[model samples]
Target: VDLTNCDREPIHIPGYIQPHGCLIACDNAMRMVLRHSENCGELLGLEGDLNGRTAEDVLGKRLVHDLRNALTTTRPAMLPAMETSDGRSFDISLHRYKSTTIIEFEPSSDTQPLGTARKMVDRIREADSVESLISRTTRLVKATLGYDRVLIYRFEEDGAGKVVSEAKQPELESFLGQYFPASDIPQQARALYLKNTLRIISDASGTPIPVLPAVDVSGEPLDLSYAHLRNFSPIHCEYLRNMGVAASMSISVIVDDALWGLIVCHHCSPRVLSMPVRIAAAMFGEFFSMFLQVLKQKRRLDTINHAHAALDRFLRLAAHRANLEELLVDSFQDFARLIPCDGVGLWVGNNWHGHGATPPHDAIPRLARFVASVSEGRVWATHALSQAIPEAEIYADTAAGMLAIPISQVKSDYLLFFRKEIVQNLNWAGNPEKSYETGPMGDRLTPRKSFAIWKESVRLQAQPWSEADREIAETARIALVGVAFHHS
Candidate 1:
């Protein structure tokens, strides 16, 4: 499969490596040598397929013994470095995936691992919000790695990505506030990303060499899913070259136990990262992901607890013979203050009431019906109402988005929050759809030929509710259910 069919490409068993390094895999027992790249021995300055040999023969006795001890835990491990032929050395990487343990040897650089890890951590975590946290770190990482471009990309629910933060050399155009389509990175590649946290391409020119004995004695293709030196799909290689990138690195961004996005670095010419530098880069990426998750979840918890307590105060103050209608009417301003909405509405006992900006009085019943049909339960929301209800097109300005809170089981009464439309201009790296207009061969699909920004406009939608806000609304619904029963 090529670029066009990247959706389900079997990239794990590419059977090749970038030639900048050599790769080998042994059984889980770490006894028998199962596979090695064609250049494994000569490249290693030793002498491998040449297979079925004992690990001690190939890796020498000391390193093999140390490797055995390192497998105490399943986490990937990196040994300091190994002297190959003479004074020259190579960095060693070890990790296990489906019953196979893969080892990689990348030539080492004289560069020292910068002492900046602790310093950068101290600086970034001081920020008060995720925005500043990312923006500040982006600049610092670029300063450390010295890449031409560094970007903090984030994924939305739809799998599309936004270049949320970036720092680049003066000659390069800004990619900040731009988007790259979900099509650019299909599901297969994304799945692989989580399995392997960090990946780099030292150079994109030479074809990689396939590992020998495609399948092992077990009659299965050797699993190289976690190998850092495992070569990428040829299509991806071509994509990098077409975009004029000679070298690139990506660090996975993870949050809430899911793949979030990537911390990307692009160099204009071929460059190899000393293992020390890459370790620092990977460390920062992981720390950033962990730090972002904590802050976001903590914010959600804060909003929920604070809102729940405030609702208790409002209820205690109005629990007298006063009904929900009277309590709600006087609380008009508070409703907007407590939640994120341009307007609020109440529908009870066949009566409709609204405050602030809202759809026309006649339109409330229609919107109410739509909410009931789609509501999974007490908490339901939609950021783009026009997509589900064509009739909402005209009311887009006043009610493009909605959050519905069901307060009664006997009757479909809802307390609604409405958000105004927010038109957005999306700048794409290129037309993600028509990227294949022309390329190396002219007819075959290739990465986009141009890196120019293409503008696209989106309308009839509002800022979607954050997870914190959604939780806050859910808590409100629980409180409302109790109060509505007494006042219904």
Candidate 2:
């Protein structure tokens, strides 16, 4: 797909709501309905036009009193389901957006017991490892939510996603281990998920009811980011329909105040969750995120301890060495292993020493110039060395990725780690790029129509450097600085 078009999509201001529920916006005073879903009359028991009318005029005096008390708080509030005079039941959610307060009316249905939700959470907490936790999470979500499929979609360093774990109907085709391009969920969409945290689509094929006035009195479309009944993007809806999914729900898996991944559910038929049920699932997501944080911290602590031990050994060796050049050249293998790389090179005092697999010795001066120009006595790294330094393309087969850190004040003393190009095959759900045909809305960047596994080979790149690699490299740089000072 055209990646640029995905980010340009304004998904927040769709100007409609799914037909299954109703949405209403009131002025900051919380007295009158400023805008509402066209289906408000049938779903919320509000008859005729509701514009400019007091809350009591639309919802009787009692519910209005309850709403007034509920609106007193600044946070989003989820009140108990209320029964209308006409016998219609709605679960109301209240949240203030800028100069307006939004009240969403969702049709409430039969809810599973809280004890059942607790049991599912217990199963999730029992897993000791991330793999098991993800596996169990997908299964539990598919079973608890009664969706046709559930997948634990994890974001990669490049913002692409992979179906790391999945649970689905026995007859359905598997999407496990398939990769989706970063454009599938653009940066703007990912930012919204971090704010909203949870999204539910009862039916993808259902009609979208437009807002009555479609704009405020001031001639601006209402900001519906916090609206529970906000309409799905037509592009997103079409994407789901192409995948044969009639309904969908997604809950963010947040860790350390960041969006870690998503608990995505899909259904082949229309399905709606009671407001209480959805809230329980959201609560479970919170618990799952905490578990993820704990595991991630523990793993990071172990890596840190191992790196510290390695650094300690190098520091002790540097203290006893008289020549800085010999110390680095002799310990180049240890330096390479400090982070993660196949080879190491040292460029200091107009001399270059190489170990293991590295670029040609003749290319060392050019590499040093590139590193000196970009680093400024700091570490600089990239997997696509050829892209960054076009002259490096000739050595891509030997060193497609490079991490270099300058140790001296003049930025001449340098240590470089090299990783050779790794040609790898990737299994994508479909073609990663777009087709030439126009979409239903005359948009050229349509979602892929096929779910088949398309094998493709990537070249001129190495395995990406991890955060831990950067951390250890920084630690080693500090140690090397002390050694360089001693020699000077």
lDDT of each: 0.75, 0.77
For model 1, how many clashes?
0
What is candidate 1's local distance difference test score?
A: 0.75
Q: Each candidate: RMSD to true structure?
A: 4.4, 4.4
lDDT of 1 by residue, 27-70 (tens): 89789788888888676666526578988887777677887888
Candidate 2 local lDDT, residue 481: 84
Worst 10 residues of 2 by lDDT: 449-458
Show pairs that collide, candidate 1.
Answer: none
Off by over 4 Å in 2: 1-6, 45-47, 73-75, 110-117, 126-132, 156-158, 170-182, 316-331, 334-337, 342-365, 372-376, 395-398, 406-414, 420-467, 481-488
Q: Can you write out model 2's per-residue Cα lDDT over 1-488, one digit (the tens) per residue?
A: 23346567777787888877788788886788888888888877657888888777787777767776877633578875686656777788889877788888887766654666687788877777788888888888887778999988888776767788889998766767675667668787898788776888988889889887887667888878877678787777777776678889898999989888998998999888778887788788888988878888877777778888988988788778888678777777677667778788888887898887789999998888888888877889998898987888888878889999777764487888998875433443433453334446443223333222121222577768889888888887887787777777
